[PDB]
Structure 1
């Protein structure tokens, strides 16, 4: 499977995906990395790995549909089978999501359905859980609500900040995101007809 990774930041999830897709029995290859922001370290990481990049600045488009269409043009340009959202910070429109249904994965730093949204660590700390985690899910129109592929629990330590908890959860993300990509890229896991996760 030919894979696109969309990013908006540092790209530590991108990095773990690069490393894993290049291990010997991989069913996936990363052929493009697209950022919606310029000068993010995730772009340098892509280039240092010899992977093409594109910056599609979301602020240059009048609405979501048009920004998403520009992204889709690059995806078709590169003949992409699977899209991975790895720290990508834009909610995608219905038509984009519908087109990419069953072929787009996201990594989210909580155990869904808890702590949906972009500030999950802040929510976890405020709520006082002693256990949080991360989730790889298929992307649905409903934000952070698509079908769950993998999850990994991560403890919250007394006196954690957003930063310390965030780093602990990243360590788990770097394991399940590559394992989940490999599940989809091979036969193994698909979004079935009945809209549910199916293990072939």
Structure 2
């Protein structure tokens, strides 16, 4: 299966996916990395690994639909089967999501359905949980509401900050994102016709 990874920043999840998809038994290959932001570290990681990159400045299109259309054109250019959102911090439009339904994965740094949105760690700390974690899910139109593929729990330690908690949770993210991608790329897991997760 041919994979695009979309990023907005550092790209530690991208690197974990690069590492995993290069293992001999990987059912996935990463063929393109797309960023909505210029000059971010994730682009350096892609270039270092010999993977093509494209930057699509969302600040250059009239609306969300046109921006997503620009992404989709690149996806078609590289004959992509599966899209991974790996620190990609934009909401995707309905038609784009529907087109890629069952073929687009996202990593989110909480145990969904808790702490949806862009600041999950802040929320977890404010709420006072002692267990948080991360989630890989299929992307649906409603944000962070799509079908869950894998999750991993991570403890919150007394005195944690976004810095120390995000660091601990990223260790787990780097485990479950590669595992989830392999499950989908191998056809082991798919989005079921009834909308529910199907272990084939």
Which of the five TM-score ranges fits, normalised by the shorter chain? over 0.9
C-alpha deviation, 1:31, in angstroms: 0.2
Q: Please give the alpha-carbon distance, in whole angstroms, between the structure 2 residues aligned to 1:87 and 1:25.
A: 25
Map Cα deviations across residues 135-176 of structure 1 (whole Å, 9 max, x no partner): 000000000000000000000000000000000000000000
Report the secondary structure of 2:143's partner residue: coil
Q: Please give the alpha-carbon distance, in whole angstroms, between the structure 2 residues aligned to 1:20 and 1:6.
A: 16
Following TM superposition, where does structure 1 have runs of at least 4 consecutive aligned residues deviating by more than 6 angstroms?
Answer: none
Q: Please give the alpha-carbon distance, in whole angstroms, between the structure 1 residues aligned to 2:64 and 2:34.
A: 16
Q: Please give the alpha-carbon distance, in whole angstroms, between the structure 2 residues aligned to 1:64 and 1:12.
A: 26
Q: 1:94: which partner in 2?
A: 94
TM-score by length of 2: 1.00
Gapped regions of structure 2 (runs ≥ 5): none
Q: Does 1:177 align with 2:180?
A: no
Q: Please give the alpha-carbon distance, in whole angstroms, between the structure 2 residues aligned to 1:15 and 1:83.
A: 15
Compute the RMSD of aligned alpha carbons. Answer: 0.3
TM-score by length of 1: 1.00
Report the secondary structure of 1:101's partner residue: coil
Q: Please give the alpha-carbon distance, in whole angstroms, between the structure 1 residues aligned to 2:187 and 2:82.
A: 13
Q: Please give the alpha-carbon distance, in whole angstroms, between the structure 2 residues aligned to 1:193 and 1:6.
A: 26
Report the secondary structure of 1:68's partner residue: helix
Q: Please give the alpha-carbon distance, in whole angstroms, between the structure 2 residues aligned to 1:124 and 1:67.
A: 31
Gapped regions of structure 1 (runs ≥ 5): none
C-alpha deviation, 1:187, in angstroms: 1.9
